[PDB]
């Protein structure tokens, strides 16, 4: 059990219950308006957060993308809207703009003022890890001890413990076998006592393992968060919700939560 | 690691290189035709083993619907077929008629004579947990103990243990939450040291957890297949083969096995 909430402005969303989804979002009037329609269709078939990402597979711009996009859903689905940035003044802009969780793929290590602005607003930050090289003494010894550096920057950032969610980053700076392997071990984050957030959807190790094109993983995307639940972790992060959130509740269901 | 293989006539089935597939199947032309194209299908899409089975949801009649079947099936598709009986003598015409496994949802107490027939022909039975009430002092305790009958019978018979699969029954003589907290516990079974092989394909419970038709419970599927192979089973027994073969592959891959 969690003794605590993850509140959210607004929204507030108890951690025992249930595996939470979040539903990854793919200024003119088309591009604000594919996003509301499809935020929407996410909030329909079972998301309990929205997340508002630059596609990662100059700074002026992500503002000017991404607050227009935040602004919209915010006032037409009602749910918490987390902003994927690693960008501080970034952050700044899209929490002013309505945005209640942050989400940065660089685990505050690219831009350390950013954790700071999570202090400031009271937002959950999720911290991901991930590093400029990768070879590793100890691929699971390294990424706990990585995320412990952040966390470490959250903290002296004034960032309570709360507030703050871990993430593998299972994807990145990884070789295939390294992601699998961190699959097998995500226990171990557990030790760290924060909610953990898996984030698997169709990535390319999938394809590597199952020899397949991102629009034939989503069974491979299945079998991730499945055996991420059955590890304790407390969010998935995934493209497929009508599919995810069903995996999910039948997964608590049987683990028993 | 086990260090014996499924031995199946004409076929062998190692045990450690992945979760082998079972695909459950759906004397006239037309049966016998249907059933043919589809067996084709299910061997073009990632099954490892047949399943011929009355839908279960008299016995000169069980003998003309089921032989045609076996016969047309194992001369045009090249993979060990398992016989879904708890009939004797049915069983007895099926490996005679050419199928290579037996597969008894009664796991022996029904007809005890069917494992005399497994004994003679050596063909491995799949011993299913069953009772004709349901209810126990402890359900882990009390299946174990049932699945441990079985055994006796089948050893009493002559069946080597190397033949012999379990099955913890998952959808029988169980309430919905029953079958939900054997799920939890399937690692269990293990300790009685033989292969297992689960069958939750589009079961009542799936619908009860999730709200949903028979044809709407594939990502439920996949969370037991899940589940179940990561409490390490051996075979799953699946409608929906394309789909579970993967999600197999990938929780495989992950689980490193
Ligand atoms: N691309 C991503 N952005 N934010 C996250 N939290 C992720 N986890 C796994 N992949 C990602
Ligand atoms: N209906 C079934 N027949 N044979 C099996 N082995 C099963 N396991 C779960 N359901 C079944």
Request: net charge negative; aromatic share 6%; charged share 30%.
């Amino acid at each position: 059990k969690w003794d605590y909430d993850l509140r959210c402005g607004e929204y507030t969303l108890n951690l025992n219950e249930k595996t939470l989804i979040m539903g990854i979002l793919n200024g003119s009037y088309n591009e604000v308006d594919a996003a509301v329609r499809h935020a929407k269709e996410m909030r329909d078939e079972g998301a309990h957060i929205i997340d508002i990402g630059e596609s990662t597979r100059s700074v002026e711009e992500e503002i000017k993308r991404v607050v227009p996009m935040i602004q919209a859903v915010s006032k037409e689905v009602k749910l918490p809207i987390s902003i994927d940035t690693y960008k501080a003044e970034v952050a700044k802009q899209a929490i002013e703009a309505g945005a209640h969780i942050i989400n940065d793929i660089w685990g505050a290590k690219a831009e350390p003022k950013i954790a700071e602005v999570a202090a400031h607003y009271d937002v959950p930050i999720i911290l991901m890890h991930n590093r400029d090289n990768m070879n590793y003494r100890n691929l699971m010894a390294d990424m706990i001890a990585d995320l412990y550096d952040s966390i470490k920057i959250a903290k002296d950032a004034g960032v309570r413990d709360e507030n703050i969610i871990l993430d593998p980053g299972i994807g990145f700076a990884k070789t295939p076998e390294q992601n699998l392997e961190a699959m097998r071990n995500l226990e171990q984050l557990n030790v760290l006592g924060y909610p953990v957030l898996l984030g698997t959807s169709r990535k390319s190790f999938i394809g590597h393992v199952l020899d397949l094109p991102v629009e034939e993983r989503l069974e491979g995307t299945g079998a991730t968060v499945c055996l991420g639940i059955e590890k304790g972790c407390e969010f998935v992060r995934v493209h497929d919700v009508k599919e995810m959130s069903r995996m999910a509740k039948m997964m608590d269901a049987m683990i028993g939560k």
